[PDB]
Symmetry: C2
Amino acid sequence: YVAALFFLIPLVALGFAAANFAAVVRKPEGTERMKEISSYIRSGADSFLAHETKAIFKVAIVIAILLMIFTTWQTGVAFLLGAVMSASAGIVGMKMATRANVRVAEAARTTKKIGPALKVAYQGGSVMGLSVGGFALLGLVLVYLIFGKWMGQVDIYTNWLGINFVPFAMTVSGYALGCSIIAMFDRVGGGVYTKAADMAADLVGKNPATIADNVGDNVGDVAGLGADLLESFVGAIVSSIILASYMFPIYVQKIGENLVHQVPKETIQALISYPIFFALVGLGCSMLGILYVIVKKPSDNPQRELNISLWTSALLTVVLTAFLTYFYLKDLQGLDVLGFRFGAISPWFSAIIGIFSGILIGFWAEYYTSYRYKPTQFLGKSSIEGTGMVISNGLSLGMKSVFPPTLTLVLGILFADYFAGLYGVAIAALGMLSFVATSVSVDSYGPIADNAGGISEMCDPEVRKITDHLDAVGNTTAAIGKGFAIGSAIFAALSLFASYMFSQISPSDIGKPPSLVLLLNMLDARVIAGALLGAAITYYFSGYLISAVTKAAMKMVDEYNRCIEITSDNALKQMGYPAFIAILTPLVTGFLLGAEFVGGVLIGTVLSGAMLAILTANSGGAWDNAKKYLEAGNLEGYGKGSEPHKALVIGDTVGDPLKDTVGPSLDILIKIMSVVSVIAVSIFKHVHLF
Amino acid sequence: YVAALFFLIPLVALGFAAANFAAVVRKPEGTERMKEISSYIRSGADSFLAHETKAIFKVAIVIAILLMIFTTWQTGVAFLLGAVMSASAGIVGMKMATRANVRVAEAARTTKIGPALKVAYQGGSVMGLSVGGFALLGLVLVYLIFGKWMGQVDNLNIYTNWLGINFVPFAMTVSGYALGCSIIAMFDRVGGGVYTKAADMAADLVRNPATIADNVGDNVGDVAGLGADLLESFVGAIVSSIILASYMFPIYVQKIGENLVHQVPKETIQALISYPIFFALVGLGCSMLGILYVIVKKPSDNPQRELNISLWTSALLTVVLTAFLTYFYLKDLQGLDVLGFRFGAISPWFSAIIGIFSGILIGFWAEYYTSYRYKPTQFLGKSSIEGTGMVISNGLSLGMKSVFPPTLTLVLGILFADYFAGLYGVAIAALGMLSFVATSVSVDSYGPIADNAGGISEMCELDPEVRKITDHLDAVGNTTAAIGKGFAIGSAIFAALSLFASYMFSQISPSDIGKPPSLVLLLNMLDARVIAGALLGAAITYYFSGYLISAVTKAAMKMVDEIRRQARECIEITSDNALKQMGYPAFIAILTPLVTGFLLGAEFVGGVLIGTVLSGAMLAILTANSGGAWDNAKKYLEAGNLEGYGKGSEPHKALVIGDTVGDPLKDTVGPSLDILIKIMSVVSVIAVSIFKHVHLF
Ligand SMILES: [Mg+2]
Ligand SMILES: [Mg+2]
Ligand SMILES: [Mg+2]
Ligand SMILES: [Mg+2]
């Protein structure tokens, strides 16, 4: 029947990846030289891939035993599964990118034109997207099937240390943590590497060991960007389930010495299962979206192509979900009490809002960052007033650039909660992040294309024309993408804060009104302090990474797989450090000061991290595109040399660590710190010191 | 009471200023060139003061009228009183400064350095004593007249006005006063701050070309602006103490057998209202003693040592006298238990102590990260050899990190404050921090006086040996100002957070009366409205910061053009345009709670206030320390401390560009945020009277 059919969807996603893999490999490369440059970058990634995975492993071990001891073994098992699922995606995506690039450039010559070359480049990228979708959903299907149904977890426990939680809630929290861990290293570690290289490269003006930087371009927006969305994706689904699950013990009435589950088992179990099926449809829609664009007759405009896949995947998801939402939950009862203002159909509306939020947030990120529209143009043209001015105007731009996307978030959240309550916020995150496969594909297109262009550069002009066109679009979709990935990061984290608070329900809270158990009071000094602490930590976090990039860059600068191994090792050492902050802060503050304080910290972290991620992303991209702006020739009389170009160079170099390392790291911070807190609040709620 | 004795302290503060004014006035200026230069900057300042004064009035009236219609006539008067009181202080401090500089400078030559410090410090203190004297005088007026005479401290039940708008009479009244101080503070910062840096830019975008415009700027920022800023936080802390106390009366009521029982009784409330006033009075008295000793003292060779003695003297004194004051005034009270007073009577003195020390620590943190004297700036400086790119990124890195230690200090200070004396303890901690604001502001005001004295030497070219003393005075001005700036940010955050507590207390409705406090003293972060609010408030704080960068440069260019159009073929021109382009930020500051409030209600604005304070606190620290560090890194090389030879060399050029980026950040963006996180709270405390019930969606 219809059940398992849906549950094999991640498999189909995976097979499609597995197919796209096949169809890419059979494409050729021209000449010994196209191959020779290619081998440099492909080997570079694995070397880099080796040390980190190995580093990850050591960390992954320590965390797993701990979850099993302090929570339950399922939770510990689930965690490794999530880590493996995300891990796997990265291993696959990196391998693909560094081989697909060449066959684009050659496409730009073998097939001899740009439309059949876009079809190549895009096919590679989709492997990363479908694997991200396929793995993430496959894992959750496994955990659901094995631990949820068979072991009866879907059928409120307190464990051998007296730590209490709803088993499955706790279980998926581990799974979420796993994805988080692989994302953090990929971002806070790989992010340091990529920009250390870019800096280093931009610090030796004469064939330099740029190859490091070239793998970086892949490392960052394929693996890093990809892992971010997966986590937010998983973050959105997990958060929907956690809030749902705890609603069961929360909503009980005491009726004459009986306990009456005012939200009954049937209702809870569906609201739990619902986001998974939603996500399957999302994954399904992207497959239809992906294939259509793939099979289509080629175009001259690859931007239009890429865009067809998103919209197709998104229209599709909006539609089936309404049926999905309507028929499912159709006769459920108590949805009123659950927070469903318009009954059965309510959460579909939330998903739509998230979807539309996502698209808008993308436009805003682009708007403030792309010359073609006003903000970046002015920055660019302000270069004529000096280096001071370029820097000042770029800071001013980004600080302002924060308001429209955040306002977009504000209105979306406001409307989200009207439709489906706190649950609606989490479902919004999921809708936002539905079609994630296609979303990640368009992100991944950028590096696949960029090296291809580079690969043309290292070895015609007619060929370079196609090459240059592909890249222009890559860089845009990458900028839209970050902006979208940040939007989703904020929404996930907000869901995860909600998750943190639901997860605090105690046996000893049972009875009392929702308004008395779902509460973090800001008038409480601990919560205010918490918020300030988390905010300071987020700025510190951001600060450390800037200095980290230059440290590592410099480590490279003093002098091709060895130079990569050297800085990669140094890169890892300096990943640990942020990670203590990221991982232990809930633990440290929790065991010191308790659940209220940590609630503060999470809020500070999210608020400050949301603002700073956006600021750095847009101003950093602006500075780059401002550099681009003058280089295409637009200030008239100024071009590729001259004091304004220098000032723009200086601005881009300030910008380069900020947009591609700091901001994207902050995405992970505001999430993982929440996920961790969701898990550890099991313990430090009761056992805290003061 | 014994109390009238206390109530004439503000008069003396003013008289003490007035005398110090006289004794400075009677000091001389040297050369005709020395006199001519003094008049230049002094006249320059006056042109600017007129237009600003004229603008506040136009704006202050409308707000006064508005308050009178919607709240009470009393509230509007009090507001104007507050507006007048802070204004006056700024008007007085500026008048003093632009005459005092020379007579510092002349001391550096006619007598010979110790008697030059003795000159310089006397001028500064007029501003500090006026800031203390006025602000508390105003408050004394509001307390005596509106509180006692009109009986609001006699009643202090829950009132309902001619529009059916409800509030606790005295609470509402003093809220207007705080708002009064805020409006003259906002203008002085968001207007004078843009001007100051529009000038600095303009001057550094070309002796004596447009330097004079910049030289008046130097006074505007750290005398008038800084003095008004600290004044507001000072008043903000006291007003918050009063607001929390007043509303505590209706909160701690229990319905018993259909009776209403005030668990915290009238006697306690009236005392808790009066207590923070007396505290601030004791502080000022202590600060005057702190002030008098250092002036009269045998001179030193170390002007730092002089200045620091005044601070320490004022603060020790305040700790001591307060503890007698605190114990004895609350000696035999009742219901302090229910109030949150963990140790009965003595409790708030401990909070004040926490605040004092927090204040002092926060000062230290600002110095550490900003002075080439310590390590963070040393590294930055040395990184100059690697290029302009490195300097900017490293300077950014420095300030982002620099946020943690003062904030941690703030975290620990709040935590302890609330343990001792509850939410009330947080505000008293704010008050204690600022309890010796008079001596603090003097050292702040000391700063511009010295800088100009130094500059005056360069234009006049009076000796090198004389110039040696002059340069020394200035170096220390710039330092104590960074400590000073640092302290005012610390205190702004503690005040703003207290004003947030006030905002929530001010929300009790007749229909909340009865129910447990813990159900009424509530802002639920799980509520989406509050979350959205917080995000919105956070983004708005970033916008505000971003706008001001663009505002300064816009204005700057307009100044640059005023040089270019006068010299190819003043002062007022760039100052007015600076003003014109201020309303807009000021619109953001003042109307945002109203708009979002009438749109979305008390929860959303609650969110906004938290976001605003959180974001503003963080960005404030970053910009102050980084901008100062960037400044001090260039200096570091200017005193010759690399090996790169220095001075027009390639690393130096890179540090200059960083300093040009930094200056609007440390002196305009950051200091405006101090004001933003406060006034937005004050506005909210007042307007939550209305949009709590009357909101749209
Ligand atoms: Mg690059
Ligand atoms: Mg670049
Ligand atoms: Mg100076
Ligand atoms: Mg300067």
